[PDB]
Amino acid sequence: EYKPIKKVMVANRGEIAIRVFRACTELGIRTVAIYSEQDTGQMHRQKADEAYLIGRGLAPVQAYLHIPDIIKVAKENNVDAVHPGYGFLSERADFAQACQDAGVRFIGPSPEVVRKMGDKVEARAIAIAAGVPVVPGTDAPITSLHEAHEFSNTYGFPIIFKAAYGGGGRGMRVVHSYEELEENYTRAYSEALAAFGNGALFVEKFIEKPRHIEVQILGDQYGNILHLYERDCSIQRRHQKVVEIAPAAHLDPQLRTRLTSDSVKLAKQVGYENAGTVEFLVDRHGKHYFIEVNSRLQVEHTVTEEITDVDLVHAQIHVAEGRSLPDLGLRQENIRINGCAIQCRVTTEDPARSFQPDTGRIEVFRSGEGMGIRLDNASAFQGAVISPHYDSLLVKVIAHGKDHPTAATKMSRALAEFRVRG
């Protein structure tokens, strides 16, 4: 109903750019692409209609983080909408505020919601405000061994330190005794103060057999919030996602509906109005403990996208247009379960030494197309050279079938069909 979008520009690289270009071409919207000098041999450059260079004299990883160049290139090319992707400016409210001040549309939540998210304190307070139980532990950041000692004495003996200033694993070590406790705390504090910024640490209860379930949330500006479905990704080598399964493995209907209701209530209370992810945690006895809320679109969205046969990028574009959810004809009672899907990622890590990423030149490449097999090629082609400056993703593969063993067997055949030499 509002000002239609005539041009969309994106600030990521690899598979997200390709996906959004397909989405825009489906709606007949002109595409604008950006790239760095050290990254001039990809495919998304020739896929779009026009391409421009950024970060001419910057670092290869820092070239995509320079806001003013993106702002001016968007201003000069009459760009109306910009997509943030994930992993590049998506979780920094400064870019969103600058885009809003520049008169360009931003595909995503308001800067206020982003600022509310991010740091764990505000999200944790909002969680305890209404339902959605969180893991027991300290509230304020802990920097003293004494208060850590009382916190360990009160709750339980096995504890793990969780740090701030970065969502990565960093120094996640678990304390099981007393003698190692002091030395581990001192080492973690030294690493936080030296290798990182704020030495904010928190003491909590490490779950012996964790199981985390994700839920997607889609919102509009008319105060309508719809949950897509749940996700399980318990396969973690250390703390990173490896293999994704689309539906719940074995969840009680009461558990799944209660989790859905809690996620919807949290989204409504925060008033989220775009596509985001809500992360929880399930114990063997069963206790949904809040972890965090992702304000961007996750890379593992394709499983839910395939189960419900709903295109999320089209939904995001149309909701950024202004059209309400009923206009799109998307209703919570209009979606249903259809089959199962398994998601896997092709990396260039040596699977023997330490999962250490490898570098080289691809000599032989063939791909496997199957029945419920869908492929997303990032930079895989004949005579390609992979750079160590960025991540090491070749192909994102999704396998869909009527049953979990069926999808597993189909994916096994598909990977057996893949042929990468060099």
Partner: protein
């Protein structure tokens, strides 16, 4: 040989029709010129060297020349070009 001829070309043809026809025939085959470097247009791409050609405001591309084969049977050579990330063979 007219598909989008404009009045400017109409007036140019009345000036020198023969060379206009020859120029149009040459341009149709080998493609759009005056996007190349002058030394590139006169001399050509030296082997094992990569250069850049600008086409439109965003359409920008790179070429690298690899090698040249020998005469096969009919006085034909094969040339291997390396585009942005791919390989093409031309005869």
């Amino acid at each position: 040989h007219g598909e989008e001829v404009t009045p400017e070309d109409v007036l140019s043809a009345a000036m020198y029709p023969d060379v206009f026809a020859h120029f149009k025939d040459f341009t149709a085959t080998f493609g759009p010129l005056d996007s190349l470097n002058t030394r590139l247009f006169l001399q050509g791409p030296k082997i094992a060297e990569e250069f850049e050609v600008e086409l439109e405001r965003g359409k920008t591309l790179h070429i690298k020349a690899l090698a040249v084969s020998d005469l096969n049977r009919a006085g034909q050579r094969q040339v291997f070009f390396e585009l942005n990330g791919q390989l093409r063979s031309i005869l």
